[PDB]
Amino acid sequence: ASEVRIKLLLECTECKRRNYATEKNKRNTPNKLELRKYCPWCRKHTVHREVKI
């Protein structure tokens, strides 16, 4: 990673719990990530949103 190849987390938009940790390239993806992952808390897949790490 670098200053452009940042770090970030995913937040189960339903219960707002952060679940996964990944990265992106804020120049090639300056839009906040929105990915559909699985929440062990809700116990069902859910759209997760890039929050800041």
Partner 1 sequence: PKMKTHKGAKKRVKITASGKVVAMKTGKRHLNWQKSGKEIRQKGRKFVLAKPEAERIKLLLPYE
Query: Which positions lie near RNA, rule CB under 7 A?
Result: 1-2, 4-5, 16-25, 28-29, 33, 35-38, 40, 43-45, 53
Instruction: Using CB under 5 A, list all residues that contact Zn ion.
Output: 12, 14-15, 39, 41-42
Q: Does 53 contact partner 1 by CB under 8 A? A: yes
What is the spatial distance between Cα 21 and Cα 7, in angstroms, rounded to a whole number? 8
Tell me if residue 21 falls in helix, strand or coil.
strand
DSSP state of 6: -
In angstroms, the CA 1 to CA 38 distance is: 25
Site map 17..46 versus partner 1, x via CB under 8 A:
----xxx-----------------------
